[PDB]
Design a protein around this nucleic acid. Structure first.
Ligand SMILES: Nc1ncnc2c1ncn2[C@@H]1O[C@H](COP(=O)(O)OP(=O)(O)O)[C@@H](O)[C@H]1O
Ligand SMILES: [Mg+2]
Lengths: 93, 107, 88, 579, 98, 107, 93, 95, 86
DNA sequence: ATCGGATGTATATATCTGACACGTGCCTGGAGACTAGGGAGTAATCCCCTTGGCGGTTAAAACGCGGGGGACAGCGCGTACGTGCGTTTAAGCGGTGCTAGAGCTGTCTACGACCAATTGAGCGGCCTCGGCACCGGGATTCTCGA
DNA sequence: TCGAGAATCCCGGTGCCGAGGCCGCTCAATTGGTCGTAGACAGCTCTAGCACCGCTTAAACGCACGTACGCGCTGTCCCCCGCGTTTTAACCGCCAAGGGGATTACTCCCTAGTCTCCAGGCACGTGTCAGATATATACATCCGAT
């Protein structure tokens, strides 16, 4: 009966952004649906993008191009920067 | 040796391994890279941090200390680009931004 | 007598009462409402409901079930391009 | 005494072994089997075990002087029993028959509590709404010098009473209805409640009823139950009553079940019945209806085992094979086929004899009604579905008789007007249609003499109430119950389950109070009565362990059932010319 | 002579109080009956969950609120303040439904 | 052992093998059934024939032999079902349906 | 080199529904893109539908449901009839 | 001399019957490859790319003008004005 | 490439061209202020589509914008185009 | 109403150019073993559904009425468009050259997939105690007739 | 024009319920090792995109003038809103019994995938003709002024 969800991760992000602020169950479910929806959008865009170029791997470059295509304007660049940051850190250890 | 989660390795809060599994099982491509889950998890974390900060500010404005769907709706619809991202979405138990046309007002 | 012919049970669409349409219009932000709005609103609501429920029933019948779930309605709405957050 | 002074005693401005020790001391004077429950809930609840480890006679012969008028001797013994129960730190339920008089006994007991040991309240009385007024009168009539109020009305009236008298403590009795008790618990949760009395304790049967939980949230120094019939259908409801009455003792449902019911011992019989009689004797008091009254003559209950009609058989078999989503549909078909959509032939509709012969039961019903019309009686059909009751009303019109219908949708003033006009002196009112679970208990159909249960209910208590609608104190000529049953059908199953429930009730409770085409209706009646005697002789000698078997022989079968039951090319555009 | 509010000053108060709350403006039971009636015309003998009806109600109410916003815009565009069926039809036709 | 194409066995004109390969290599599912390509090819053939017959009728109504994008646009837009199916689709070198609002016409 | 296309099959259908007309090259390109678009929509809907029900295979049942779910009104029933006809003819061979 | 409105209707009937493009090719190509330099330097355009852009653009503009005409008619006029375009775009969801 | 970048090319979408588009759209009488609005909306639409097409071509490590890139951009924007491949 | 123009609208003829037919080859779809795992079927089970009916509360909804203000029609006018003419001016095509820069072919290597054990992380069940909802009540503010 | 009057808001108090710590387990992530095979780089080729550049010539532009249409103002109904009964339907709480769908666990079988060959089907490159322009050309067919 185990059901995976992004509840604890959303809670951790909230408690590192607003250290003293809770969240109701309905708001948590809305946040989980939002995360799932955005994940599906980006993954689908990257999948189609890789299919266009006759590739078989979804790599970080496809994810960057997809997030650049979807997220509007000034919201994209920050996200893009964040992504690159993580990858660099991840490839240092 | 000693285990280290890829999330902590990349300094993230979202699960890199779970994202990798959902990416392989979702039938998106025959293969997935090694940095794709890290990049996607970082992007998701950034977006959720943005929306959560806006919602927390909205909730604080109403002198309340829990986030409820009304605060999420109110935070999303008040930011133009976050609203472009979620233009076609309806938030259950959300509402409508206070908006009365100036023509309708008393003279 | 002939009372075995109970009643028409007028109509379920008339259950969407005029005050309900007025409240929805107020939330939409209108000041005055013509008297003929209450029929057009029922018509458009019925059309939208049929469109959504057809897809929901198709989804729940493919799964070989007999119980329409919230997830089925969510899938139907997403298919029509009206993504709904808060039910899974 | 003084309002301000009385505020110190009523309002609660603030493991209770203190009275529990004496309770157990007196209770263990009986058989040690009583301690069994305790010796269970000492392992589960060690903190309450601290009592088991360590271990006035007031006859009140004559009627109380303070009460107005004389008091009947059996009610005298009733109040004696109540006083004895009080002076033991225990509580019991009173289960006298309806019409024998219980409110008088309770108010005499309250007069005792106020005048002999001097505790003028507080007292809470919970009663059905229709009964509420019928309390204040007696409170004002038998012991006038006591104040009480009904605590009823809309939000404004109830809130005004709460602020004015309840919190003001200008009261002794706060008689209030069930829904009002649920509505305002917070203002009523702090009175410290010397006693709580629940007339018609049938409502407090389900342990998880909202009313049940609300009442368990109260604080009372002692409780009491008034009911006409405990143990209506099952046993577990009796345990629920006892648990509410004494929560420190009957605290484990599974104990009472497994010890007696949930696992029936391989013992034959006649031991566990003595166990139950010993257990319940100090708690439950009951008297036969016919005990001290005489007059009313016993009821001549009868069965009519009608067959079934050709269309009725066709429809019933159509139902058996597989828009219809219950077994109760079968009950509809054996009741009257016209309840289904489409049974009526032809979209033009008539009211001539074309429906009497189409229904099996109504044929015999028509024959009996005619025989009584040229015999001079009055009938009280008690069908269970208002839709069939409507069809029967249309029938009554066709045959040119006089209606009188009181369903569950009949307004209160219409209810009382119908009751008055029918119960009036000589009048053109032959038949009185009425649905079995309607009117509560304040219906007084004493004028008529013949009752026809058109259908049978799941629990026989409802049918007993229907019978008491005409067999109460008053009507003194004859009573004739004429329940109709369709043989070779699910009605047999329902009748069997009802009979087994009634027999279980007779065994458990009714043994304590002993020590305390036309069918030629004559031959049909003879064979039906023979079959009734057959079932009686069959099932009277059955065992207690079998009484709870609930054989549940499926009626879905009844005869042998396996439990298994172009493109058109579209319209096309005519002309495609641009011009 | 009891005081009386001028026509249109209670409409504005209703506007600004219903546009601040979040609750559903349609009664639950009539909407549930309507949903069941519509559904039983597609394939017989369905049953719904309470959550299915709730989600469907949220979606429909949001749809109607958006439609009424566009209707108000159409009415104001024509130098009016009263919304008329012409406006609903124009909004729906521009929006792409019909 | 002469080779018979699956299209011949199914009585279709569209290719079943090509559709099977496109389904397999398109990353739609882990496995692909046997009747799925046949069913999908039949549906595609039906849709193509349905649109193309209307296009041919429109071509004939204009006294032409070969059909051009204008005829396809006319056939799609005049038919309610196909106009609903291709609602969000623009057709190159198409045009518009001849339609003038009645209020604009002279009195 | 050797770019695959649907031209030959569309032409074979045309010379059985209108066996005298012709078709321009631009019209052929439009028909090819239409066939590709409809194929992609049906296949994507079927894949998502199979993913919802935890299945791992695409069968004629998912294709039929996707057809009934994407095409409007009478087109859906006509397409379903054609598909079932073809499948039943195929399996009996 | 014709009267105002006759030639407008003749042009309406003329241009709803033809299928070509109503924007000259060099002006549109210059506009496209001026806009495109805001996103990447030294970009080359195939002819087919500019042709597809032009056809999509003209289809969009025609579809917008239909809604503008309907809005102006709804407001009891026959002349389309900028507020009609703004209303159509706002209702459709683009603004 | 380096082709002596120009200005006022939005003025190249001239008044008669907008009038012809309006006539095809079914418009009889045209106000005089509508041309600037039409130019503005055209510029917005072109900017969006070209941005998406340039992103698509940059991802492929190319320097030439192909017709398929424009088609993909339009499809992503919900404006499917038939007749240029795919 | 009738007549004088201007404009589509049929109608015949020449073109060409784009569609159709025909020859090659290569690559992909079909035939035939072999296999294993996905899915169909069986069976507990159990929690929640079904229908028919009852009792009571309490807001919402329905109906009636008065009266204000808003829509709708009509009139006047005065710009702002449409229509027709001359005159340039910029598109559209042919022609030319240059070369970046897509597109195809070979090698190999670094990187993802697969597999076996292991273990921490995440989910489910449970308890409780602050945050938010509800209810006076008191003050504030906007409204509407003077 | 100010003085009631009504509605809203902001404070206290309950009180109750659900969010948020806390504990057990089990099962996906992680680590380590082996193994193909995408794709990345290097190389070669030939193709079309960039850049002018002249001719032509057809549309764009500026200009006049003169209707007619958009806008503003005025009257007049009429219809919708605000307010007051009062009636009913939603909404709980119940009763009575089924049985019926949805959800885990096992079992196994048959239908996919994976190979290995090997011939036809289809894509490319050609070489023809007829269908649709383009001109003219005469005909019929609205529009507008008397
Ligand atoms: N002096 C009296 N002694 C005993 N009973 C009396 C006296 N006076 C009246 N009664 C009867 O006591 C009855 C109370 O019984 P009833 O009202 O049927 O309720 P319940 O059945 O619950 O006791 C009344 O009906 C009334 O007729
Ligand atoms: Mg009584």
């Amino acid at each position: 009966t185990r059901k995976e969800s992004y509840a604890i991760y959303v809670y951790k992000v909230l408690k590192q952004v607003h250290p003293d602020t809770g969240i109701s169950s309905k708001a948590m479910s809305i946040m989980n649906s939002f995360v799932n929806d955005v994940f599906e959008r980006i993954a689908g865009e990257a999948s189609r993008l890789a299919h266009y170029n006759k590739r078989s791997t979804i790599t970080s470059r496809e994810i960057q191009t997809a997030v650049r295509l979807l997220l509007p304007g000034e919201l994209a660049k920050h996200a893009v920067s964040e992504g690159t940051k993580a990858v660099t850190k991840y490839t240092s250890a | 040796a000693k285990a280290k989660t890829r999330s902590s390795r990349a300094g993230l809060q979202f699960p890199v391994g779970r994202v990798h599994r959902l990416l392989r099982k979702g039938n998106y491509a025959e293969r997935v890279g090694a940095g794709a889950p890290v990049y996607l998890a970082a992007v998701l974390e950034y977006l959720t941090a943005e929306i959560l900060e806006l919602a927390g500010n909205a909730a604080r404005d109403n002198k309340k200390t829990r986030i409820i769907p009304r605060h999420l709706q109110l935070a999303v619809r008040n930011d133009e680009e976050l609203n472009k991202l979620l233009g076609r979405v309806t938030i259950a138990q959300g509402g409508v931004l206070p908006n009365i046309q100036s023509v309708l007002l008393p003279k | 007598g002939a009372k075995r012919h109970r009643k028409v049970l007028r109509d379920n669409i008339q259950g969407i009462t005029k005050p309900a349409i007025r409240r929805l219009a107020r939330r939409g932000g209108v000041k005055r409402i013509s008297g003929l709005i209450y029929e057009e609103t029922r018509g458009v609501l019925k059309v939208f409901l049929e469109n959504v429920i057809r897809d929901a029933v198709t989804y729940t019948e493919h799964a070989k079930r007999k119980t329409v779930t919230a997830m089925d309605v969510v899938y139907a709405l997403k298919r029509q391009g009206r993504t709904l957050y808060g039910f899974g | 005494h003084d309002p301000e002074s009385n505020k110190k005693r009523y309002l609660l401005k603030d493991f209770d072994l203190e009275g529990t020790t004496k309770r157990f001391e007196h209770l263990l004077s009986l058989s040690g089997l009583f301690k069994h429950f305790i010796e269970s809930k000492a392992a589960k609840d060690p903190k309450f075990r601290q009592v088991l480890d360590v271990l006035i006679e007031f006859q009140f012969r004559e009627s109380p002087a303070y009460v107005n008028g004389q008091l009947r001797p059996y009610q005298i013994q009733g109040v004696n029993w109540l006083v004895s129960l009080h002076k033991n730190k225990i509580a019991g339920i009173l289960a006298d028959e309806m019409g024998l008089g219980k409110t008088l006994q309770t108010i005499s007991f309250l007069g005792y509590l106020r005048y002999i040991e001097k505790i003028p309240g507080p007292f809470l009385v919970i009663a059905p709404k229709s009964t509420l007024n019928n309390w204040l009168r007696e409170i004002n009539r038998w012991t006038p010098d006591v104040n009480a109020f009904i605590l009823q009305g809309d939000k404004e009236e109830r809130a005004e009473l709460i602020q004015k008298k309840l919190l003001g403590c200008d009261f002794d009795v706060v008689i209030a209805s069930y829904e009002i008790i649920i509505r305002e618990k917070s203002p009523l949760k702090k009175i410290n409640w010397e006693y709580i009395i629940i007339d018609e304790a049938h409502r407090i049967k389900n342990e998880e009823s909202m009313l049940s939980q609300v009442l368990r949230e109260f604080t009372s120094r002692n409780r009491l139950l008034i009911t006409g019939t405990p143990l209506q259908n099952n046993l577990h409801e009796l345990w629920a009553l006892l648990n509410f009455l004494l929560p420190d003792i009957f605290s484990d449902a599974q104990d009472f079940d497994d010890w007696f019911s949930s696992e029936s011992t391989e013992e034959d019989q006649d031991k566990i019945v003595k166990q139950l009689h010993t257990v319940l004797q100090p708690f439950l008091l009951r008297r036969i209806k016919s005990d001290v009254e005489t007059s009313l003559l016993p009821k001549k209950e009868l069965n009519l085992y009608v067959g079934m009609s050709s269309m009725q058989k066709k429809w019933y078999k159509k139902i058996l094979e597989k828009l219809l989503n219950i077994m109760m549909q079968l009950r509809k078909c054996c009741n009257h086929p016209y309840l289904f959509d489409g049974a009526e032939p032809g979209p033009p509709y008539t009211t001539d004899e074309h429906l009497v012969y189409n229904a099996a039961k109504l044929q015999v019903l028509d024959k009996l009604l005619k025989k009584l019309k040229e015999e001079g009686s009055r009938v009280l059909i008690f069908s269970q579905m208002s839709r069939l009751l409507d069809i029967l009303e249309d029938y009554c019109y066709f045959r040119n008789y006089e209606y009188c219908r009181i369903d569950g949708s009949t307004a209160h003033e219409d209810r009382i007007q119908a009751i008055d006009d029918y119960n009036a002196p000589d009048s053109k009112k032959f038949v009185f249609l009425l649905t079995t679970r309607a009117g509560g208990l304040g219906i007084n159909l004493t004028s008529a003499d013949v009752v026809v249960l058109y259908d049978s209910d799941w629990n026989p208590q409802a049918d007993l109430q229907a019978m008491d609608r005409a067999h109460r104190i008053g009507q003194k000529k004859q009573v004739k119950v004429f329940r109709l049953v369709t043989d070779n059908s699910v009605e047999e199953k329902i009748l069997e389950r009802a009979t087994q429930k009634l027999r279980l009730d007779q065994l458990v409770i009714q043994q304590n109070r002993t020590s305390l085409d036309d069918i030629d209706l004559d031959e049909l009646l003879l064979k039906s009565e023979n079959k009734t005697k057959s079932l009686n002789a069959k099932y009277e000698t059955l065992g207690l362990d079998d009484l709870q078997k609930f054989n549940q022989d499926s009626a879905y079968e009844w005869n042998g059932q396996d439990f298994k039951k172009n493109p058109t090319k579209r319209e096309r555009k005519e002309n495609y010319s641009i011009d | 002579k009891p005081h009386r509010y001028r026509p249109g000053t209670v409409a504005l108060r209703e506007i600004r109080r219903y546009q601040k709350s979040t609750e559903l403006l349609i009664r639950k039971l009539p909407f549930q009956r309507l949903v069941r009636e519509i559904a039983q015309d597609f394939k017989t003998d369905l049953r719904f969950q309470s959550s299915a009806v709730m989600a469907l109600q949220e979606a429909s109410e949001a749809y109607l609120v958006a439609l009424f916003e566009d209707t108000n815009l159409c009415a104001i565009h024509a130098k009016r303040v009263t919304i008329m069926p012409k406006d609903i039809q124009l909004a729906r036709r521009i929006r792409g439904e019909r």
